[PDB]
Design a protein. Structure first.
Ligand code: MG
Ligand code: MG
Ligand code: MG
Ligand code: MG
Length: 128
RNA sequence: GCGGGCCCGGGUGGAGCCGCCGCAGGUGCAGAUCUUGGUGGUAGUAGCAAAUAUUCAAACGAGAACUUUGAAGGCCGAAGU
């Protein structure tokens, strides 16, 4: 019985797999982070058949559901209760995110204040 | 998040750290027979073959083919090992 968002449309994604760098599987020194190929003779660079896809502007997500969580909210990093009170007038569209560096002593106070103000927390029972 | 990357959960860690508005740079690596350091397959592999040769018993010793003692068989054969 969580706080439902104002609008929960169907989120559609053009692609969900990560874009992996070319030859990142063959070598350990080559990481999964994408790098634009620029070789003169590169199958991926000139889009050969059955090769690794390159990121394009076409894969852009719909602006209505962009940055939207599966619940229907948007993340907002919160470091203290004063920053939590900012989301008072955006509770139905945005949810508070508690920073990892916040100690457990203040995390419970932030969670209690969010419950009082009716703001969803994506990590309410995080550290205890 | 198209992406460069980023935000949380868990574990280790024990003392500093980050966001924003601007400023500045010794600021982003897959190659350069690049420099330094480390680690693999090869691989328990090549190899431990130049100059005739060792054997028996005892002692010390936890442990003896290689140490010592005694016996036997050999070599260097006075421009000699
Ligand atoms: Mg390198
Ligand atoms: Mg060409
Ligand atoms: Mg052998
Ligand atoms: Mg002779």
């Amino acid at each position: 019985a969580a706080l439902r968002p104002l609008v929960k449309p169907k989120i559609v994604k053009k692609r969900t797999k990560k874009f992996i760098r070319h030859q990142s599987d063959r070598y350990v020194k080559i990481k999964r982070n994408w790098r634009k190929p620029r070789g003169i003779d590169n199958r991926v660079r000139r889009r050969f058949k059955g090769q690794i896809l390159m990121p394009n502007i076409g894969y852009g997500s719909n602006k209505k559901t962009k940055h939207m969580l599966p619940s229907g909210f948007r993340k907002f990093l919160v470091h203290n209760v004063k920053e939590l009170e900012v989301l008072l007038m955006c509770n139905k569209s945005y949810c508070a995110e508690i920073a990892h560096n916040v100690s457990s002593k203040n995390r419970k106070a932030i969670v209690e204040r969010a419950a009082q103000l009716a703001i969803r927390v994506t990590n309410p029972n995080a550290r205890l």
